[PDB]
Amino acid sequence: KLGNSAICCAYGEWPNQPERFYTLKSVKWEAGSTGWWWKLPDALNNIGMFGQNVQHHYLYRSGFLIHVQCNATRFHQGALLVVAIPEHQRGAHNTNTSPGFDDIMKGEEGGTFNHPYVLDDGTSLACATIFPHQWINLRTNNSATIVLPWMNAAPMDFPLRHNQWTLAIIPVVPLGTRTMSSMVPITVSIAPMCCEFNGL
Amino acid sequence: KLGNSAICCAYGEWPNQPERFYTLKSVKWEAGSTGWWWKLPDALNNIGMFGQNVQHHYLYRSGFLIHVQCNATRFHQGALLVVAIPEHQRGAHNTNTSPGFDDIMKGEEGGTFNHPYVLDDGTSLACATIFPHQWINLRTNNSATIVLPWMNAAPMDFPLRHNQWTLAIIPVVPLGTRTMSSMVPITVSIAPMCCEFNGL
Amino acid sequence: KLGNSAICCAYGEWPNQPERFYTLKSVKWEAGSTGWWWKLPDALNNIGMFGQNVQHHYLYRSGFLIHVQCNATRFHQGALLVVAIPEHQRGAHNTNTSPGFDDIMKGEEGGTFNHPYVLDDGTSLACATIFPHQWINLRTNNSATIVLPWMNAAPMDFPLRHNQWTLAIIPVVPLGTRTMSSMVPITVSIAPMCCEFNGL
Amino acid sequence: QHGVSETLVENFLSRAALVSKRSFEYKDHTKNFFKWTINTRSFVQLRRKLELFTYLRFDAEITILTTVAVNMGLPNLTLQAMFVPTGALTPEKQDSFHWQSGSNASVFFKISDPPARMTIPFMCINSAYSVFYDGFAGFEKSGLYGINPADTIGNLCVRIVNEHQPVGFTVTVRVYMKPKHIKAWAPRPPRTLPYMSIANANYKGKKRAPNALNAIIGNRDSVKT
Amino acid sequence: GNISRYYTHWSGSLEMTFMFCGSFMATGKLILCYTPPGGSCPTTRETAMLGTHIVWDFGLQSSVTLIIPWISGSHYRANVGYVTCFMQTNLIVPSESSDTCSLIGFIAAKDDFSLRLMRDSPDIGQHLHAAEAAY
Numbered sequence: 001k002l003g004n005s006a007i008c009c010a011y012g013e014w015p016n017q018p019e020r021f022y023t024l025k026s027v028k029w030e031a032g033s034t035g036w037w038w039k040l041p042d043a044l045n046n047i048g049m050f051g052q053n054v055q056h057h058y059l060y061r062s063g064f065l066i067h068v069q070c071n072a073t074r075f076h077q078g079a080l081l082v083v084a085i086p087e088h089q090r091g092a093h094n095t096n097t098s099p100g101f102d103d104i105m106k107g108e109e110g111g112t113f114n115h116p117y118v119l120d121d122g123t124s125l126a127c128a129t130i131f132p133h134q135w136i137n138l139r140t141n142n143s144a145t146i147v148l149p150w151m152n153a154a155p156m157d158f159p160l161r162h163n164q165w166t167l168a169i170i171p172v173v174p175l176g177t178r179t180m181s182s183m184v185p186i187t188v189s190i191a192p193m194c195c196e197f198n199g200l
Numbered sequence: 201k202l203g204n205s206a207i208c209c210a211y212g213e214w215p216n217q218p219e220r221f222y223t224l225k226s227v228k229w230e231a232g233s234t235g236w237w238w239k240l241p242d243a244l245n246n247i248g249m250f251g252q253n254v255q256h257h258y259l260y261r262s263g264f265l266i267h268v269q270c271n272a273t274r275f276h277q278g279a280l281l282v283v284a285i286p287e288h289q290r291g292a293h294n295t296n297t298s299p300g301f302d303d304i305m306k307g308e309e310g311g312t313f314n315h316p317y318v319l320d321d322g323t324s325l326a327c328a329t330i331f332p333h334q335w336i337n338l339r340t341n342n343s344a345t346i347v348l349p350w351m352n353a354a355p356m357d358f359p360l361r362h363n364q365w366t367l368a369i370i371p372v373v374p375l376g377t378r379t380m381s382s383m384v385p386i387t388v389s390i391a392p393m394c395c396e397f398n399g400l
Numbered sequence: 401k402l403g404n405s406a407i408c409c410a411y412g413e414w415p416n417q418p419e420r421f422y423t424l425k426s427v428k429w430e431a432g433s434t435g436w437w438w439k440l441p442d443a444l445n446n447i448g449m450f451g452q453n454v455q456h457h458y459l460y461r462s463g464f465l466i467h468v469q470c471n472a473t474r475f476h477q478g479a480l481l482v483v484a485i486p487e488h489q490r491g492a493h494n495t496n497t498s499p500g501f502d503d504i505m506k507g508e509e510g511g512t513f514n515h516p517y518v519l520d521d522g523t524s525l526a527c528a529t530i531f532p533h534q535w536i537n538l539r540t541n542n543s544a545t546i547v548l549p550w551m552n553a554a555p556m557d558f559p560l561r562h563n564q565w566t567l568a569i570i571p572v573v574p575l576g577t578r579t580m581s582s583m584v585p586i587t588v589s590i591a592p593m594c595c596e597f598n599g600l
Numbered sequence: 601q602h603g604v605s606e607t608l609v610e611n612f613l614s615r616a617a618l619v620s621k622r623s624f625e626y627k628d629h630t631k632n633f634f635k636w637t638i639n640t641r642s643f644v645q646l647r648r649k650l651e652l653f654t655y656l657r658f659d660a661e662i663t664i665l666t667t668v669a670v671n672m673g674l675p676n677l678t679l680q681a682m683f684v685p686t687g688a689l690t691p692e693k694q695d696s697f698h699w700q701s702g703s704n705a706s707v708f709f710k711i712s713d714p715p716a717r718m719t720i721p722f723m724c725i726n727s728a729y730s731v732f733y734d735g736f737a738g739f740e741k742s743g744l745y746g747i748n749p750a751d752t753i754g755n756l757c758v759r760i761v762n763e764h765q766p767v768g769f770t771v772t773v774r775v776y777m778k779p780k781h782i783k784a785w786a787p788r789p790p791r792t793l794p795y796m797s798i799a800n801a802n803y804k805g806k807k808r809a810p811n812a813l814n815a816i817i818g819n820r821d822s823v824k825t
Numbered sequence: 826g827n828i829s830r831y832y833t834h835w836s837g838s839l840e841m842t843f844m845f846c847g848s849f850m851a852t853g854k855l856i857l858c859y860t861p862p863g864g865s866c867p868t869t870r871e872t873a874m875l876g877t878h879i880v881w882d883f884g885l886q887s888s889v890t891l892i893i894p895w896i897s898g899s900h901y902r903a904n905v906g907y908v909t910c911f912m913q914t915n916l917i918v919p920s921e922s923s924d925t926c927s928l929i930g931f932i933a934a935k936d937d938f939s940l941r942l943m944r945d946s947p948d949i950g951q952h953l954h955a956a957e958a959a960y
Contacts, residue, residue, distance in 0.1 A: 607832075642959060644951055799954070
């Protein structure tokens with residue numbers, strides 16, 4: 001419970017100034033889903049107190065606390081890989097041109113994995129557990145929580161030009177039930193940690 | 201466990217002589233149900249050891265211990281307001297004549313709320329939680345237990361002329377399931393406390 | 401020096417939460433001037449951090465620190481009465497209709513005294529020194545500083561419906577010099593004290 | 601009153617209210633006297649407040665206010681207000697023998713005086729009045745429902761003591777009753793529907809919302825409006 | 826609401842409780858938003874994040890207490906506040922459960938509540954049958 005809004009550490013790091021969850025729109029998970037991604041802080045630059053701090057200051061320095069919750073019955077099955085990818089330089093498929101500004105900076109709506117098997121950058125989803133990650137096996141649990149530190153070589157950074165973390169939610173085992181028409185909502189809540197801003 | 205028969209305090213009162221539950225007939229709760237009521241000790245005047253103590257003595261003085269249990273599966277929904285109303289003077293609808301002896305003294309079978317929204321006395325069901333009450337939300341629990349003290353200005357009273365307490369069971373959220381033909385039984389068990397009788 | 405912006409107590413009162421001067425537009429004082437007035441916090445409701453606190457919260461509670469400075473040469477003469485009037489209910493001249501919303505809520509620009517001899521409310525300018533006031537005699541000084549406490553019977557108040565203080569600047573001796581075409585600027589700086597706001 | 605809360609049940613209820621207002625004519629020809637059974641069911645503003653509770657225990661401070669008007673000079677008349685409790689005999693007429701009763705407490709007051717004032721004590725034989733009685737009075741099935749025989753205060757019989765005069769004047773007797781030393785038990789829901797009688801708690805509701813049978817609160821357009 | 830209409834000036838904190846009355850396996854998220862007096866009543870779920878709001882997963886809980894802060898009542902005499910509720914997710918039920926589920930809302934006053942300047946209630950008012958039986 002942070003702020004007024006109510007509802008594991010990456011690499012063993014705990015980040016230590018305004019001090020709440022920004023619940024994004026629920027995405028709807030079906031059998032044909034490939035995945036979802038949100039780049040941070042691009043998902044939060046147009047929202048609320050953090051958006052007023054971004055659009056009026058010039059440098060940002062903050063960690064992130066992400067709670068992904070996937071609410072289903074006991075007759076649903078499926079596994080998600082909720083993985084946070086630092087510096088997720090996306091590649092484009094079958095072309096030599098780099099992805100544009102529209103292909104990367106999707107805002108609050110986020111994006112969809114085109115080829116989640118290669119994480120859309122020629123790497124592998126199988127080895128994607130080298131990142132900070134949690135699994136949502138609907139048989140077992142329905143939620144995931146990832147702490148994200150300040151991931152930068154630089155001390156402070158530009159929020160409108162660069163996205164340090166990418167939260168990815170990839171269905172490894174697809175959504176299943178008997179009458180294959182069911183949907184399961186996934187709700188993402190992102191709380192920034194230690195919101196340091198400069199250059200008012 | 202009281203006596204041989206086996207299966208919260210009103211206003212903070214614990215009543216302190218024969219010393220068991222009289223399980224009434226189970227009523228059947230459906231989607232079209234409005235409610236049920238039992239006047240005490242009129243529900244127990246024709247039953248068992250308490251009925252032999254009523255019909256052979258002339259004054260009664262006893263508390264009541266009520267266990268309402270509503271047994272359903274996990275696919276049923278609905279909420280009951282199990283509320284005990286002291287001195288529930290019933291009103292009749294759309295007439296100036298007071299309710300007769302047959303309309304009030306229903307015995308072990310009890311009665312049914314005609315207009316449970318007004319508690320059948322022109323008051324409100326919304327404010328009916330000012331009485332001792334418990335909720336049976338089938339999502340959450342299936343039982344309720346209400347202790348009833350000696351509620352009388354008089355020291356002892358007439359069991360065949362006056363009913364101090366009225367146990368009411370009112371479905372606030374109606375019974376629901378997918379195939380809307382299902383029933384859920386409600387079982388009422390009333391145990392008298394400190395059965396004091398005079399005038400053999 | 402308060403905040404980042406750089407440049408006596410009313411009734412013996414010192415008011416004790418964001419913690420700077422809002423320099424209003426300089427008014428130009430000439431021989432034909434009658435006076436100027438600014439209602440508080442109406443002069444500050446559309447400005448800056450205080451304006452963002454007013455337009456997003458619902459109740460305000462703050463004192464005021466006013467610095468009036470009148471910058472002239474040693475060949476100018478004239479006296480100002482810088483007087484702060486609590487609850488300055490303005491009257492309209494030669495009519496029975498009360499002053500409208502436009503006649504009272506002038507914003508950052510403020511207003512001009514029509515009949516400063518009667519303080520525009522049928523009272524007297526001669527007795528206007530019963531209020532907290534300072535004199536700017538250009539012979540002697542060029543500045544004035546008035547502390548304004550929380551002046552309200554109520555504990556908190558509505559900034560968009562009610563103006564507790566009215567800062568008035570009235571030239572008692574008119575501006576004089578040999579070639580009577582000279583102007584002298586008057587600069588008003590208002591710093592709110594103990595900015596308490598509620599109802600975000 | 602002088603508490604701290606202003607929501608004390610003493611403060612909430614001890615408040616003088618016109619419980620009875622009846623003129624009665626008086627002339628030289630042979631009701632010519634006032635009689636009223638002491639209850640609070642007669643006026644719905646005091647009734648709904650006392651029906652917030654199940655049991656009430658209070659003294660009753662009666663204040664008889666008497667005016668006279670022409671049908672020259674308003675005559676100074678002597679009145680007798682006599683409290684006949686439950687168990688004693690009531691006057692059938694203005695000149696009956698029951699006005700001379702030693703044991704029925706009378707009070708003799710003039711129109712010129714300040715208004716007469718008595719305190720009727722707690723008259724019940726139980727430890728509280730039953731505002732709501734879930735039972736029957738008599739031991740037969742012909743008894744009435746909701747009427748506790750132990751709950752009746754008494755009667756307040758008011759006549760003009762003076763002999764009959766040929767002049768025409770109407771005497772209006774306003775009775776103001778103010779509870780005292782109120783103890784109250786077992787609070788109840790406030791009544792939403794309008795009353796139909798004073799003998800019982802029957803209900804009909806208004807034709808449309810608000811306070812209708814199937815809609816107590818007046819409607820709005822949608823839940824999202 | 827009934828006892829306070831016997832008084833003219835109220836002041837205190839209110840306490841709203843919402844109870845979800847669906848089946849055991851019904852799952853979903855609501856978002857309950859409190860709007861202070863004079864603020865804009867929201868229409869979209871995205872807009873209602875600038876005020877006091879909570880996200881209620883009614884699979885986990887079945888009841889939610891929403892403390893309304895101290896109002897001071899008849900100081901306004903535009904509205905005195907709002908409590909709105911938006912869907913966050915859909916309602917997820919199994920096939921044997923009913924696909925329609927209900928909410929019950931409650932309200933009580935808190936310990937700092939206050940009523941003064943007693944009047945008579947606007948709710949009751951006036952025929953009465955047998956009214957002349959007492960005479």
